[PDB]
Amino acid sequence: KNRAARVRVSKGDKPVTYEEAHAPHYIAHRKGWLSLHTGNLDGEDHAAERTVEDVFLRKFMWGTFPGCLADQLVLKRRGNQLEICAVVLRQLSPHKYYFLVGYSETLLSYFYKCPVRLHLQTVPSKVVYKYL
Amino acid sequence: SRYSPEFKDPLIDKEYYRKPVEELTEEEKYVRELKKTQLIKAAPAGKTSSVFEDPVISKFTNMMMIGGNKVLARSLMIQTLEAVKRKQFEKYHAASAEEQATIERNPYTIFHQALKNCEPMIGLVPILKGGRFYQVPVPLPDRRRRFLAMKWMITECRDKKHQRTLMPEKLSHKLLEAFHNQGPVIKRKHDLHKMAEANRALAHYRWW
Amino acid sequence: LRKELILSSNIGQHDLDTKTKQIQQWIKKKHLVQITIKKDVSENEMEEIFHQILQTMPATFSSRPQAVQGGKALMCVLRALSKNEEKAYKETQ
RNA sequence: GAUUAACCCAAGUCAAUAGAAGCCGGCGUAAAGAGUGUUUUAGAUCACCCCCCAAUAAAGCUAAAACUCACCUGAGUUGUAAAAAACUCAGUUGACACAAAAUAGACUACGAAAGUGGCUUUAACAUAUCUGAACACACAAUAGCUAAGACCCAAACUGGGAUUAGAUACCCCACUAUGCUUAGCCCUAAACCUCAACAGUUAAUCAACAAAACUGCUCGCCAGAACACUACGAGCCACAGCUUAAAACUCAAAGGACCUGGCGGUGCUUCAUAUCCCUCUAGAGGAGCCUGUUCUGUAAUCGAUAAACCCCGAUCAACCUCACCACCUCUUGCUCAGCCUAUAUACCGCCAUCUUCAGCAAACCCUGAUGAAGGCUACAAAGUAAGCGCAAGUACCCACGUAAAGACGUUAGGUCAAGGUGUAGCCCAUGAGGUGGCAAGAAAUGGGCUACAUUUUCUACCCCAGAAAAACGAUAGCCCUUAUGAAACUUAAGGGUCGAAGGUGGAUUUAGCAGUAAACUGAGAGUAGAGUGCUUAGUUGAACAGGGCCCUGAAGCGCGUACACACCGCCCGUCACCCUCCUCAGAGGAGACAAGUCGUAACAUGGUAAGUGUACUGGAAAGUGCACUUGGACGAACC
Ligand SMILES: [K+]
Ligand SMILES: [Mg+2]
Ligand SMILES: [Mg+2]
Ligand SMILES: [Mg+2]
Ligand SMILES: [Mg+2]
């Protein structure tokens, strides 16, 4: 049986988001790409560089905002600007959100030598697309 | 099948489509009216309304085909027909006026008659009664009879006994033999009939 | 007629005696007894079984023991001694 | 086991033993209604109230079919799934038994039970109250012994013919004891309707199943399993027997009825749509080669290894890759070390598998006496179901088709070597680095490529040609060159050289339902280079598509079930493997322990239905003969 990024059914007590509810084959059919850049297009270059940057960014944000991210990030790349659109939970103090936003933006800008913006969207609780 | 079940096989007959409307029975008019509002498949590339079209020869060429070489198969078929016609014309001219009445020169007729002669009337089919299969003699459908005739002809031609003999000549010679009710194909048909008669004792093993 | 028997190298003595009696019956009946022995055990150890079986009938090897089945088994053929062979046995006796 | 702590009793605690608590309960299937009938002594209150069919013995008779003998006719008869063996006896007609008693019988009677179904006759079917024998009398099917007759047919044993690995069986043939009559014996049956006799009730039911539940009275019987239809003792016309019938050792079960699941060489019905068989096409199985694997070899990896491995991890090994072997070298080591060290039977991760399925289902409700369990009928009868899957939706060129998708689970199915990860293990090495080196073929086997040619081969062209045609046929071998690379005999390409095996292939087996099979032509992945492999675009382009159920299987409805690790199950017996007990002059018997040897007897229609009694036979379970039982079935309107 295929196990790829599928949330196996349960007694109906497992909340899941729209991203998790959909198996891989739905990509481009019901769910979009969590990272948007030109590396994968026809004839473009630096696909590996973009992918490594994306993976490191995801791990970095996860470890920097522990237990605050509600859904996966959305990486966008416009020219050289990198934009990390994140959805977080309204638990940690806004002071700490602002501190971490500034720190993340600055550190990532210096690390990837390209302007970085972080766009936070706060929600009360993880959006439950369905119960599996 | 890319064709949905709704699609119906096309009918290719100028005479059928030109038949007078007055000659049509109620059911025939209804059939035409129904086909007016039906989906029809595309005309296959193997058949056309050509007056010279011969379905039997088309099927024989298809059976003779090897690996989708319709061109080569058709070339062999036309060469066989030409060889048969040339042999018949030679015999006709070299023959006296009395027997020229019987000597036939239509290659299509010769081919049809040879196949009809070769058609085996009764076949041997495995029938199982009580858990043991036996080769019971059995009547055959016309489709199976025609197919067996064609297959025996083609296999006999393909045999390696005739070495360095081109397929046109092989098939023309065998077809003429069959037309005159001689040759290995007719021998094989008689052998099948003889085996069936020998196993006549098991006819009741059939249930249908 | 060919009467065939199949034995294991670890066959018990009671079963061996029973099959020896059966083989004696066949030999008296004048049949060719094809005996196969399968398997750790040495092939000479296996052939000792044939020695004992034919020892119980002082029958003769129509075909001597031979490795078969990829060498896993031994096979032999025993036959009733001809009249002349039995006369020779009597003379030597 | 030790330690910490806790619990119970406490100047006690509790290891061993012994005792204290032993019958108004039951008998269709758990042990138990004794094979049947009749007493005395007694008991009870059920006592006053209140024709015939198939019993039995004897005598007699015979319709059908046998046997035998006569005729005459023929060379064959018997035997089955197919044969062999067996006889020359076979057919018609007629004559003819001490054998057995179609149809009636769809009847259900007679007898106490066993038993009784051709006919006639004689005799005859106990008790105006019920129970009543291990305590006597008289009976008791089939088998069996004794003595004498009959002998058509059947038939243990025996012999022969098959079948078989074997065949002491099943199948075929012949024949005997025996089945029959007479006179005695024998006294056993699943002697079962497993349901005691008598009288009574249908009311408040009733573990399960079976043949509804009980009341009163009486007699017999039962008290865990096995040892045990046993040993001893006793009795008997019995001498390998029958009746009664224990104990010792051993065990924590044995057992009866059900529910679910699997399984069935299980039944009926319906199907399989490249599908199980036939049918169509092309193949493999035959030759060479490429390549994977198993084996052999080496100092020289690892993993998959039935379907669901075997050009598989690898969209790839000269060095590297590399985890292997030999040697050498380093030790806080690229890493706040490291380990391709064991555990896929601890896992995540990604998957095969049925699945070429459609079901899975939480939360409720009801039915079964509120048991495990089960829940359907549409002219509908207890089901409702959220969700998941299918479906729908989507990519490709349609709404077709191909993709994709495919839940819960099954195989402790694959991967600790993608990576991580628990546990365990190494830490001056199982870690790290360097040089070199193995990666071959005795041989088997899997998949693919090349061919065996004439529908072919070469040339031109891409389809109106010319030549070849014993030549066809290697991508094999050897030599040379070239491409990449630091390294090329070993990697690839080209050329030369040689023209080899082979002549359409056994049982068996693969794929395919249409732009498919088949043939042909490109491109891409990955590499510095490297595949006949892999992915994919395209050209030409078929034949059958109709019948069935032996096998595979699928479904439905059923049947059985000693299986529950679920038939790769369970389990019997012989033989030898060690202890306890009993009988015994040493040997046997039982049990237990416990792995083997030969079979597969039983549990499924257990592959010959099972079993009881009895007789003969056989390593061994067991086989067969006669009667009996269902504790088997016969599919349950007609067909
Ligand atoms: K082949
Ligand atoms: Mg799959
Ligand atoms: Mg009982
Ligand atoms: Mg009485
Ligand atoms: Mg009595």
Ligand SMILES: [Mg+2]
């Ligand atoms: Mg008796």
Ligand SMILES: [Mg+2]
């Ligand atoms: Mg007799």
Ligand SMILES: [Mg+2]
């Ligand atoms: Mg009875």
Ligand SMILES: [Mg+2]
């Ligand atoms: Mg007894």
Ligand SMILES: [Mg+2]
């Ligand atoms: Mg006794």
Ligand SMILES: [Mg+2]
């Ligand atoms: Mg005694």
Ligand SMILES: [Mg+2]
């Ligand atoms: Mg197929």
Ligand SMILES: [Mg+2]
């Ligand atoms: Mg081969």
Ligand SMILES: [Mg+2]
């Ligand atoms: Mg391996």
Ligand SMILES: [Mg+2]
């Ligand atoms: Mg392995």
Ligand SMILES: [Mg+2]
């Ligand atoms: Mg090296």
Ligand SMILES: [Mg+2]
């Ligand atoms: Mg290497």
Ligand SMILES: [Mg+2]
């Ligand atoms: Mg290591």
Ligand SMILES: [Mg+2]
């Ligand atoms: Mg596993």
Ligand SMILES: [Mg+2]
């Ligand atoms: Mg779907």
Ligand SMILES: [Mg+2]
């Ligand atoms: Mg698919």
